[PDB]
Ligand SMILES: Cc1c2[nH]c(c1CCC(=O)O)Cc1[nH]c(c(CCC(=O)O)c1C)Cc1[nH]c(c(CCC(=O)O)c1C)Cc1[nH]c(c(CCC(=O)O)c1C)C2
């Protein structure tokens with residue numbers, strides 16, 4: 001139903017095969033650092049943008065017109081899942097996401113939709129995925145994505161960003177039962193959503209556990225890890241059952257240094273790394289059979305084009321030329337220079353080829 | 358809404374009325390042979406230039422500050438239409454236009470936008486037309502333009518220039534149905550685009566069938582001519598319906614010697630000629646009721662100012678002083694001398710007046 005893929009380097013590396021060079025992409029490659037992103041986004045409010053296949057497709061394509069990135073990622077939000085479960089969410093400029101009525105007690109779970117119906121509420125995402133895959137015309141693979149259960153829970157309880165997650169963690173300690181219930185609702189919504197993304201055309205999937213860092217090992221193993229594992233097991237199972245090829249799945253646990261061994265056993269092809277983990281230490285944690293993605297400090301792009309090249313060279317030396325996809329350790333920041341993102345991409349390609357030959 | 362036209366000679370001649378002199382313009386009069394064109398163009402990438410009304414207006418005006426040309430043509434590209442249908446196109450300096458993902462099989466037509474929405478994607482062209490018509494302040498008429506369906510198809514399939522059109526012609530012979538489908542998509546996008554150009558201020562329209570020559574009579578009559586005829590019929594119909602004055606339309610089929618009789622019956626006021634067709638033979642083909650445009654070998658401008666004058670004199674003798682707009686037989690080449698373009702313009706004006714008096 002879709003054009004044949006021309007550059008599959010990203011997929012080959014995700015599965016752990018050898019390639020001629022290291023593939024690269026950037027979290028938030030479609031983002032506010034691009035003037036053209038801001039121009040397209042000035043037309044609608046944020047979630048209206050998410051609900052327009054043409055707008056999502058356009059924002060996805062923009063970075064690919066500037067840089068020879070080895071993957072695209074669909075424009076959407078992780079917060080579409082809580083929204084489709086029935087929570088109201090806003091993204092007013094200057095303030096970040098807010099839920100005006102967060103979940104604060106167990107009884108608040110009653111407001112949520114049955115998780116089995118979330119996928120049908122998210123048809124607009126699938127339309128954006130199909131459109132973008134057709135428009136990409138096989139240039140590079142298209143990544144779909146969602147938030148991990150714990151991270152989604154933090155937003156639902158905290159009502160937005162938090163430096164401590166004190167309310168969400170209070171749920172874990174004081175309301176463990178109701179927490180597991182919410183986390184299971186989330187998992188059961190995520191699975192059919194992620195499956196649907198692949199049915200619509202996604203060629204890989206990333207699960208963002210952006211708030212792993214707040215947990216620590218004991219809480220992470222009890223409350224985050226089981227649902228991370230269940231997402232992967234279930235998504236692969238449903239795809240096989242529907243006659244489709246399962247896709248490479250990436251787990252990105254920001255500030256998750258402490259969980260790398262477990263994440264390596266959690267049924268994901270790729271483990272994404274923040275910039276605080278030394279590549280060689282990550283490699284000792286995860287072993288020889290998963291692919292690593294990352295992990296340059298996004299702020300390194302504030303440095304000169306030449307220094308970026310040298311930092312990239314050092315990073316590639318540490319990861320080595322096997323089982324590795326280059327990216328930053330988090331997303332691009334809004335004040336970053338597009339030319340420096342350009343330099344990061346060119347340096348990965350240049351030094352990875354030098355490192356092989 | 359616009360200034361009254363001061364010099365309408367070009368329009369009078371297009372409609373076949375007598376004038377005091379022969380009006381002249383040059384394909385690519387805004388082009389790389391002008392140092393000031395290159396300076397304005399060094400600021401942006403090519404399609405960013407196309408999307409800036411001020412930049413398009415400026416490039417349009419430049420040649421008119423050097424030479425008393427009898428028409429302006431808006432700065433744009435024919436390839437904006439395939440781009441607005443959803444194909445990615447580049448114009449890297451030194452390489453010409455490229456589509457990295459050309460159409461290669463019938464199923465690839467699925468990626469394209471509904472042709473009814475192309476005009477709204479091309480609003481920036483209409484903004485450039487309105488701005489330029491206002492800035493011209495009635496000096497001379499402003500021509501809008503587009504590629505003809507077949508020619509646009511060649512780019513979409515071949516992915517760029519070709520000496521044979523072997524892939525595009527393979528479509529015509531092996532995929533006739535899918536070819537007609539593409540050609541109809543193109544026609545249905547072109548019509549509302551061309552209409553929009555006139556709504557925005559265009560005072561005439563040229564359709565460039567630059568790749569006619571590759572066809573020959575049987576394929577041209579089956580695959581190019583029907584859509585050329587449909588463009589004109591439909592554009593005139595929509596303009597009448599909207600309460601506007603239809604504009605003179607020019608069909609330019611480069612290397613189309615073999616189609617001149619049919620082109621004369623295709624509902625265009627003006628038939629443009631390449632330099633390989635002797636003017637008197639063209640006149641026998643098209644009859645007494647269309648206007649001819651052309652047709653000096655662009656390379657003749659490599660000759661001395663004096664020789665250019667003599668070649669122009671011979672050309673004007675052959676066309677005669679009725680139903681004729683002077684131009685070259687194709688566009689100006691980048692290494693041509695602006696003073697020689699100057700001499701071509703002055704010679705047309707001088708000898709056409711001598712030929713009447
Ligand atoms: C994949 C994605 C996301 N957001 C957006 C996209 C699509 C564009 C892209 O690929 O980044 C658009 C996307 N999302 C947002 C923006 C900027 C909105 C604006 O102000 O106009 C855009 C373009 C806003 C946003 N959205 C979010 C925040 C963080 C809130 C906090 O904890 O303080 C913020 C600031 C939640 C969010 N959103 C996302 C994550 C996971 C990655 C990460 O950790 O950064 C998370 C945690 C993922």
Ligand SMILES: Cc1c2[nH]c(c1CCC(=O)O)Cc1[nH]c(c(CCC(=O)O)c1C)Cc1[nH]c(c(CCC(=O)O)c1C)Cc1[nH]c(c(CCC(=O)O)c1C)C2
Nearest residue numbers: 385386387432433434435450451453454518519565567688
């Ligand atoms: C009307 C127009 C066109 N292109 C451009 C304009 C505006 C300036 C002008 O009036 O010429 C800018 C215009 N278009 C281009 C340039 C030069 C770009 C650069 O290298 O910087 C400019 C100023 C590049 C171009 N664009 C095209 C080619 C030919 C490719 C091939 O078949 O080999 C090329 C080389 C496609 C094209 N473009 C156009 C045609 C029809 C006329 C013709 O046959 O020449 C065609 C066929 C029309």
